[PDB]
């Protein structure tokens, strides 16, 4: 609604944007130098994705991850993937044991992402790299048998006098954690009981191999605590709280620097989808960390993407158009791909990111939300045209 909008605002963004030359992780990182200056010495970086099925977004994120690890000392890779799957992916990138394809839940077992996981294994395989990348599964949408065994195995070996008690506390619980859906079918009575049992074991291992056993026992407690309520907003809040807790646990335990890979929704400083996500991990990280948490959102203009079902099985759909969205304005900029630091913009571009306009956001199922771009992201990486990810 401003002054002769469009043309002038597109000119302001173009002038302040730093164009990207490729999405290929193997290519030189000269075009990412502006990124090092933007991030500064922040120890936590959130890396979002506009959808959960855009090939170029996943690959560009891999390029970004590679740059952060090799040029900026980032070492902890915390992904929006279940804790248990994380344990297996970490084992994969440390020893090369396992099939990553089997540890990534649908939509994620793509050629693009698996290629990154393989690079991580290669990086860790170089004896010259003494500080290894750690893979952390932040999510709690399920607790696999591997998680319970991680804890049990540790106790059986190091704390034999508690084995009986630990196994007793986990026996029944471990049969109902296959998914949120089946756990929520439990009566209030069984839920209270299982939360108590989980809290009991975590206490026993608080000390009041070991690091991961304690962390897993805590993830099990978190899972039973998150699903205790019977409403929706309270569970969502706990879920996001725990994503943040896990990310910070990784930083405080392993040191170095931490990368948080998740959907734009979860890494954002604020609320994009108020009805589905009234609380998000990103706002808790911003609150607790302030300037030590930098957010890099993902934006795209047009193309097809991989997803589940419409409005199941994996299929493809097309990005809906909205001439008022930040997304379409970004598509006008004469750069196919670019980085934009929303925090230091001036002129019309600055007024633009601070204004409220439709923002695209597509989940794993089916998409425009009124909000401010700067409100959600410190930085964004735009990829005008995108296409469907390739499920391996």
Do 35 and 105 belong to one domain? no
CATH number of the structural domain spanning residue 213: 1.20.1440.30
Do 101 and 187 belong to one domain? no
Q: Reduced to 3 states, what is the DSSP secondary structure of residue 242?
A: helix
Contacts of 315 (CB under 8 A, 6+ apart): 306, 307, 308, 309
Do 98 and 137 belong to one domain? yes
| Intra-chain end-to-end CA distance of the chain, in Å | 45
Task: Tell me if 340 sits within 8 A of 357, measured CB to CB.
Answer: no
Do 60 and 78 belong to one domain? no
Contacts 24+ apart (CB under 8 A), 32-35: 32/63, 32/64, 32/67, 32/71, 34/339, 34/341, 35/64, 35/67, 35/339, 35/379
Kindly write down the DSSP assignment for every residue of 279-307, as one continuous string. Answer: S-HHHHHHHHHGGGEEEEEEEEEEEEEEE
Domains contained in the chain, number? 3
CATH number of the structural domain spanning residue 84: 3.30.1870.10
Picking from 123, 142, 161, the residue at the C-terminal end of a domain is 142
Range of the domain at 86: 71-142
Contacts of 131 (CB under 8 A, 6+ apart): 75, 256
Do 75 and 64 belong to one domain? no
Picking from 119, 142, 165, the residue at the C-terminal end of a domain is 142
Picking from 142, 167, 191, the residue at the C-terminal end of a domain is 142
Cα pseudo-dihedral 289, 222, 108, 297, rounded to 10: -20
Among candidate residues 212, 61, 58, 70, the one with its CA nearest the CA of residue 137:
212
Report d(CA 198, CA 215) in Å as an integer: 12
Q: Reduced to 3 states, what is the DSSP secondary structure of residue 360?
A: strand
Method of structure determination: X-ray
Helix (H) or strand (E) holding 5: helix 5-16
Do 331 and 347 belong to one domain? yes
CATH number of the structural domain spanning residue 26: 3.40.1660.10
Do 379 and 265 belong to one domain? yes
- Look up residue 81 and give its two tokens: 């993937």
Resolution given for this structure, in angstroms:
1.7
């Amino acid at each position: 609604s401003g002054q002769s909008v469009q043309k002038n605002i597109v000119k302001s963004i173009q002038s302040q944007a730093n164009p990207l030359k490729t999405i290929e992780p193997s290519k030189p990182f000269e075009d990412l130098k502006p990124l090092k200056k933007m991030i500064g010495n922040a120890q936590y970086v959130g890396l979002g994705e506009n959808t959960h099925g855009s090939s170029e977004i996943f690959t560009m994120k891999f390029r970004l991850v590679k740059y952060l690890v090799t040029e900026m000392g980032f070492t902890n890779f915390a992904m929006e993937e279940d804790w248990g799957n994380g344990l297996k992916l970490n084992e994969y990138i440390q020893t090369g044991k396992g099939n990553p394809r089997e540890f990534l839940k649908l939509l994620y077992p793509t050629d693009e992402i698996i290629a990154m996981i393989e690079w991580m294994k290669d990086y860790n395989a170089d004896p010259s790299n003494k500080k290894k990348i750690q893979f952390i599964g932040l999510d709690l949408k399920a607790l696999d048998q591997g998680s319970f065994n991680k804890v049990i195995d540790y106790v059986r070996l190091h704390r034999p006098d508690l084995l009986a008690e630990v196994e007793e506390n986990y026996k029944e619980l471990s049969s109902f954690t296959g998914s949120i859906q089946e756990y929520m079918k439990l009566t209030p009575k069984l839920k209270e009981k299982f939360k108590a049992n989980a809290e009991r074991v975590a206490r026993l291992l608080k000390d009041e191999e070991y690091i991961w056993a304690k962390a897993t026992a805590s993830a099990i407690e978190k899972f039973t605590t998150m699903l205790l309520p019977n409403d929706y907003p309270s569970i969502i809040k706990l879920h996001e709280q725990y994503l943040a807790d896990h990310a910070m646990w990784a930083q405080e335990t392993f040191g170095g620097k931490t990368m948080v890979w998740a959907h734009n929704i979860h890494i954002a400083k604020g609320i994009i989808d108020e009805k589905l996500y009234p609380y998000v991990a990103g706002q808790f990280l911003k609150e607790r960390l302030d300037n030590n948490y930098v957010t890099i959102g993902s934006t795209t203009t047009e193309g097809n993407f991989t997803l589940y079902s419409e409005y199941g099985k994996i299929t493809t759909d097309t990005i809906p158009q909205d001439v008022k969205s930040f997304n379409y304005t970004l598509g006008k900029v004469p750069y196919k791909m670019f980085l934009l630091d929303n925090r230091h913009l001036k002129g019309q571009a600055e007024k633009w990111v601070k204004a409220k306009r439709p923002l695209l956001s597509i989940g794993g199922q089916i998409v425009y939300f009124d909000t401010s771009l700067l409100e959600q992201f410190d930085i964004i990486f735009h990829i005008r045209k995108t296409s469907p990810s390739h499920i391996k």
